[PDB]
Design a protein around this ligand. Structure first.
Ligand SMILES: C[C@H](O)[C@H](O)[C@@H](O)[C@@H](O)CO
Ligand SMILES: C[C@H](O)[C@H](O)[C@@H](O)[C@@H](O)CO
Ligand SMILES: C[C@H](O)[C@H](O)[C@@H](O)[C@@H](O)CO
Ligand SMILES: C[C@H](O)[C@H](O)[C@@H](O)[C@@H](O)CO
Ligand SMILES: [Zn+2]
Ligand SMILES: [Zn+2]
Ligand SMILES: [Zn+2]
Ligand SMILES: [Zn+2]
Lengths: 416, 416, 416, 417
């Protein structure tokens, strides 16, 4: 009732401002968030779980309950999924393959993802994918695709090519393209003499990695740039410009990770620029805290700004919204929960924006009104709309979800 | 009715989290916001109205309607005040003095501020003050109080000494101490050989400037650092360390300006640290956009942070909340309206936080719940609380205030 | 004699480390620096000299002696040039035209630059050009090529196409291609609603601007990204990505200005990535000081970094080196002097690097040798090498050149 | 003569032209010791628990072989570096570097657990500086130590620090030079924080407790080191800049400024003149951050140079304590120390060779053109020959050759661990 009242009051309020709450909700239903699987087990995977996170990335904290196998992960995702309203997808890492016998990265197969697929099918989730170019013996020098050693490079070329097939298979089965993100950690710790050659090797390898033409309705290739990593602070082969060059020149999607840029730099600004040269965008929405730290997405400035950028431009299809974080210092199910929910709260908010009006004031140089309107948006009752969205998806509206998380912990997590 | 309705619902919602919205309102009214006079006329002042803004600060935009005299300013202020709910104060600069005849900065007197005082009483506003140490022949070298020339330096000293006397007068008259902030533009543009001599002279001058012991119930001295300014980019005499040092040893108030630090640096963090060392804090809430640009204050991450830090620690007495912006690209009144309501909105939300519980969770390492609840706070119905606050203060609840501005503009600003 | 000896020694030290100093000088002679004309008059131009620098760019300080016409400018330039060893070019702005009658920027013609051309011929200078998209009533809104108004746009587009015609003229005449850079201040000062449309317009306009096919051997087009400017702090139409995309897609040259990026962002890193996609690069070596302040180029980390990347990669043809600074607080000739000499020094030091060796150490994981070998170069006698370069070029090797300035000052600048 | 001699003589003249006395410079360089950090020798592992994980928000990156593994190795390693670095040095010790047969609780160390250090110090003519170790420890696992809400955890840390003070004083007493004892804690939060006051308040009262024992300034100086953020502690730092500036001022302790502990673009060279008008002394942790407090080797760069300039400009020979702070585990540790050390010294030399008075004078006259121009020209003045001469005079290799030695030491020695 309370929700209902609150909701009805809000319907009016916004109605008065040319804002349709019901259309907003419906629109929110068209914006699936691809939840990254790796937040479930600290990016450990099933190749070699107990094994060491490498690649300039680090999961911090020692919170208990990480999932230890596929079975647990899915149980975890599910618990998470039932507290997050609306559309979601699952973003899988090659290292999350399910096999009886070990599989050389350069030999993976669709079959090794069969259980995921099936589960996706039963959970009504699309699947996204990623070759795993880190935490590997051959990723030990700090180079994979750009590595000078031909064999090494080949092996990474081979892994990604195969990964494309797994992806293609995902969409074939699921009926939704699987976006396949290519992120390599390649780079240097200190003053480099040759940033050139390594960029060149990368270029050619990427080239080779994409050679195989696959059906766009099943699969999409994306590239992710990064500024620096722990242990590779000085130079990243695959820089922003490198990939911009690449995505543009080869027409692949471009992945923009919110924690991968310079201080003060924001990907929300990059969206509109990039969409004029690259077919599609993949966004790894992350919260960086002074480094690509991978903290949990908040309902904050940048998250909201990203959201607006998407929504304002009706990028329902060319933008694949993903999450990218891995906080190991809190309950991971909650992490996913909070992050996911925030992303959606940010999208809804953007969807409740009287954008045409504002676009309008703006085009007219009425910057006073622009500012004023945007700021007043913040005090409109959008919470009421969020809470109803939750309820229509039979998801807790408020803090109560924590209880569910606290109960699953008790019964399941505490015994791992 | 609707407000009353949303109000009532919010009352319960918050009550459920142990928050008494009524109390919150009462507390808000204990948090005066000191509106800066200079946004009204782009810091032109009345000594030399038309006659260049200098010191590394600048007002941008050529939006019409700026006040041209004290009369216009008070009128503009008043319009602003009626759209801003609750307690406010006016923060004045010396060049805003009123005299028939010109007055040397080194010879200002209370009396050049009499009108101000009477208006202040009429409007039930408190007054704060500031020596004007820029826009002046005597400051064109880029040094005032740190000036090598004994004469010039003496002039600035004397000017600030007189100032304190003005300020002290305000406190006496209004029954509320007047905080007088000390801000100099002293610095260098390029590579500097000696950052020491200027600082030594600044130190000596300030001591000289505050040597006259005045009644604390009437006046308080504050000092504000800065990192860089246009045309004094390389070095700044009164830096952060300089003034933390000064305020700490001399026991003056410390002034923290949100647009005065390094990229990513935040004053929110500084509050709790500084207060452990200085007797009072003066906050210059400002929005920087890649420089000390003085844009209008938004209800954003940082402003919220600021509000939270104050409130969480019951900083009602020791913190003097001020604004510091000067957008000349939009309507000045709106500027003040958006900024002040934004500050108050942040405080109010801060007042509606279940800090005790959060504190307690935090104190137990319950970081999962801290983050969750923190985040869930963002969706509690504070907006209903704000709107009733606006209402109880006969202030517009929403964007309708823009119509008042628009009206005033047409009928009065259009005529300037 | 002293110099002579210094040389021999240096000559030996270096050979001792696989470095041929003769060969460096030779190489240095293959690296011209394009001196920006605008430093001589604080970007006043001849169109409307006494008129007002607009564009989010600024010139600070009030150092006397500014040139006020082509004559002075060329006079000041020559004094500079005689104090700067080796190759140079002049980079001209459209507003530096010479006409008896005022010209609409959309109608400039080669003939408006004939004097510059003949002067260039007499001084063995190549010439570079730039359309002027600021300090103009048609730029007063903060938009030019991306203006929503078709006519304004048109105006700017037109101006640009004409510019290209002047540039080609230069190269046909001079026998070396003129690089024509396109920089526009378009952006917003505050929170922007629509970042997409202005970029779409920009895009289209650009396409139109470059439509007229020119002789590559005479003319080259370059686009220059920027992050933010004063009074346009919140969003910049031609942001990094926009032009990265653009240059790659249309295959124009990319212009990298060292003062246009985020804090801590460096163009030195961008060189080699950009070069795998764009056919050419134009560098605007500048020194930002917490904003694109345009201070004089120092022989510092980034300047040196920039030089290394060029040299390391033998980008003797695809990279066009130019300066970009305008300090109005010190003698302007001095400014060019210090600036270009510095750039030249950075280049030589880079040419003195035992690159093939370091490259090989780094290819082998010999990071220890790398780092040490890198820092030791800093103490080899490159100076004996520089000073000889200077002697051979009949330029002061040392600080003595300050005297020629001081004199010129007296003698000339002093009457202005 | 030797080429070096030639080149020296030439510089000798060039510098005398600008009024600089090269011999005077070298003399001054010898009054500016660089306290080398011991932890670069073993990736901050310590001896308490040599392998067993670095914590507190700092990390050593790189898997370069050879790390020293005990006080003997460390000492030998330090020696090799020292022979390749000219002039004055000091050694900066951390408590975990203690030497004991038995295991010692941090809160109970004693002067006796560093006796070998002291002895070797006198032998080598090194003054010793010190530090309590507040990380890589079970009682520091929650991320709090001196500011921990827990009374016992707090007490523990407090006790260790108090104790650390006695060792430091004992170092001073023995070496005849005060030992600067730096206080750095990793205290902070990884994520959004509710109560930034409480901890800071606790830290405050703890510090007061920590320095309540009156010791001989001639033997001991307490310094406090602020930090912005650490890995796993990115969002809040108890001992923030303002925290310690306020602390050092109000308590008159020295203030530690770590070149890698501040915001993007923030520089410590700027802080020196400011800081010194309020605090008695300064301790500098010259370090090279690369996007985070990563502890990369100090180079001859813009900031290192500026740091030096600021010290030398104000003849800060006694109130400024020049230390190094870096830990790169991806290259030969000896080389690391060597590079960093000489670099600092190179910078210092440059400052000594600068014509300050004239520069200062131009500046005081608004002759900003001369100033800039002259600053730039210093840069191509042959300070190098001077440096090569400082090297020779201290029987340290002048150039790159030092690498050959590191090479050989690694072959024989390092290549066996
Ligand atoms: C697991 C995943 O591939 C990874 O987080 C990348 O997206 C990258 O952003 C981290 O540097
Ligand atoms: C007008 C006012 O005194 C001024 O804005 C100062 O507070 C300072 O923050 C600007 O650098
Ligand atoms: C004058 C010149 O065209 C201009 O400075 C541009 O290069 C741009 O870098 C300034 O923001
Ligand atoms: C080992 C040493 O105590 C440590 O490096 C501190 O100085 C601090 O700067 C690292 O965050
Ligand atoms: Zn990512
Ligand atoms: Zn201020
Ligand atoms: Zn430029
Ligand atoms: Zn340190």
């Amino acid at each position: 009732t309370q929700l209902e009242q609150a909701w009805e009051l809000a319907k009016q309020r916004f109605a008065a401002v040319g804002i349709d709450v019901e259309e907003a909700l419906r629109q929110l239903d068209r914006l699936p968030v691809s939840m990254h699987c790796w937040q479930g087990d600290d990016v450990s995977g099933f190749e070699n779980p107990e094994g060491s996170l490498t690649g300039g990335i680090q999961a911090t904290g020692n919170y208990p309950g990480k999932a230890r196998n596929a079975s647990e992960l899915r149980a975890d995702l599910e618990q998470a999924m039932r507290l997050i309203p609306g559309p979601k997808r699952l973003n899988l890492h090659a290292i999350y393959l399910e096999s009886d016998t070990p599989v050389s990265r350069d030999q993976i197969k669709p079959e090794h993802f069969k259980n995921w697929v099936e589960w996706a099918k039963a959970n009504q989730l699309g699947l996204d994918f990623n070759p795993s170019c880190f935490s590997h013996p051959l990723s030990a020098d700090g180079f994979t695709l750009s590595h000078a050693d031909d064999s090494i490079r080949q092996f990474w070329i081979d892994h990604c090519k195969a990964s494309r097939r797994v992806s293609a298979y995902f969409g074939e089965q699921l009926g939704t393209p699987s976006v396949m993100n290519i992120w390599i950690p390649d780079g240097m710790k200190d003053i480099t003499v040759d940033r050139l050659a390594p960029r060149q090797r990368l270029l050619a390898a990427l080239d080779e990695v994409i050679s195989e033409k696959l059906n766009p309705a099943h699969h999409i290739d994306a590239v992710e740039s990064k500024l620096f990593g722990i242990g590779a602070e000085s130079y990243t082969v695959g820089s922003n410009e490198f990939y911009m060059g690449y995505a543009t020149s080869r027409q692949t999607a471009l992945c923009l990770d919110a924690g991968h840029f310079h201080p003060t730099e924001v990907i929300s600004d990059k969206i509109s620029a990039a969409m004029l040269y690259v077919p599609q965008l993949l966004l790894h929405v992350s919260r960086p805290v002074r480094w690509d730290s991978d903290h949990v997405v908040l309902l904050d400035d940048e998250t909201q700004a990203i959201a607006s950028e998407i929504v304002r431009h009706d990028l329902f299809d060319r933008v694949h919204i993903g999450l990218d974080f891995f906080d190991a210092s809190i309950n991971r199910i909650a992490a996913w929960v909070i992050g996911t929910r925030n992303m959606k709260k940010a999208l809804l908010r953007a969807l409740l924006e009287p954008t045409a009006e504002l676009r309008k004031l703006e085009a007219p140089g009425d910057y006073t009104a622009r500012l004023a309107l945007l700021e007043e948006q913040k005090s409109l009752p959008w919470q009421a709309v969020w809470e109803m969205y939750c309820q229509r998806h039979d998801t807790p509206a408020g803090s109560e979800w924590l209880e569910s998380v606290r109960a699953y912990e008790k019964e399941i997590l505490s015994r791992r």
